[PDB]
């Protein structure tokens, strides 16, 4: 447990409801949460069940005037996750509204979150939760099949971001290698008493 200024979560490989419950509990506890890559979230069960549930959601609409009061069906994966979170928070109170203002959801990793640390929640990871052999799906595929229009744009922006991250990774590998050679060189100049004291202390 650690209080942080803002927690950036990678939505890839995560289960929608478990991540939503954990994020909602953090929001009501008072922690700012930014979830990215909501198109890479996972729903347990194979794709036709999620498609059936979203079509059953689309079926529900107010009768006398569909421009007011009715369930507004959002086809974006980020706002699907936002609906999942909002169902878990008393959003009709001032406390729940203020908790929801501490949350930001995005598709892909827009800047400047591309140069920030993205953490994962092991209590909601699909690989650590689902039994092997069970079927699953992605929120992005369901969104694309129900009406999301920006699967390709987010995709191309993601290969651009991954290419820039690859260049950053070669730079980081070079920096780590030079740091290792610097430590090996400085091992012959640091005082042996200091080295022995640090090794005895655990460093």
């Amino acid at each position: 447990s650690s209080f942080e200024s803002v927690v950036v979560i990678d939505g890839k490989g995560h289960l929608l409801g478990r991540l939503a419950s954990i994020v909602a509990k953090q929001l009501l506890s008072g922690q700012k949460i930014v979830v990215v890559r909501c198109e890479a979230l996972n729903i347990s069960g194979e794709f036709f069940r999620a498609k059936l549930k979203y079509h059953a959601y689309l079926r529900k609409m107010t009768r006398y005037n569909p421009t007011r009061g009715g369930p507004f069906h959002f086809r974006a994966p980020s706002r699907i996750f936002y609906k999942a979170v909002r169902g878990m928070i008393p959003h009709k109170t001032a406390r729940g509204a203020a908790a929801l203002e501490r949350l930001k959801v995005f598709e892909g990793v827009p800047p400047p979150y591309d140069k920030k640390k993205k953490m994962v929640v092991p209590q909601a990871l699909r690989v650590l939760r689902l039994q092997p052999g069970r079927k699953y799906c992605t929120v992005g595929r369901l969104s694309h099949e129900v009406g999301w229009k920006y699967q390709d744009v987010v995709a191309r922006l993601e290969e651009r971001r991954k290419a820039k991250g690859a260049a950053y990774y070669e730079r980081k590998k070079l920096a780590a290698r030079q740091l290792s050679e610097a430590k090996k060189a400085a091992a012959a100049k640091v005082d042996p008493k200091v080295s022995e004291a640090l090794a005895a202390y655990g460093y």
């Binding site: 036709f48 498609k51 059936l52 079509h55 059953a56 079926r59």
Partner: protein
């Protein structure tokens, strides 16, 4: 069936208080009625119960038959 692309009206699992009370009362009345028909029922009922027996896959069934036969002979000798 085209259920996935076009779902129908959902079947509600949220039961009503009227339905719950009516089902409970019909269940209690049925229990009383079957008790009455059990008391009035003229079908024959054996006093003894047909015992299922000993399983074949029990590995010491032969030794248990040995024990039963030995105790039978011992009881016959004692009597």
């Amino acid at each position: 069936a085209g259920t996935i692309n076009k779902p129908k009206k959902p079947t509600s699992k949220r039961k009503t208080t009227r339905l719950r009370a009516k089902i409970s009362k019909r269940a209690a009345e049925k229990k009383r009625k079957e008790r009455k028909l059990a008391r009035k029922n003229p079908e024959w009922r054996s006093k003894l119960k047909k015992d299922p027996g000993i399983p074949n896959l029990f590995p010491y069934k032969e030794r248990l038959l040995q024990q039963i036969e030995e105790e039978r002979i011992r009881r016959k000798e004692e009597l």
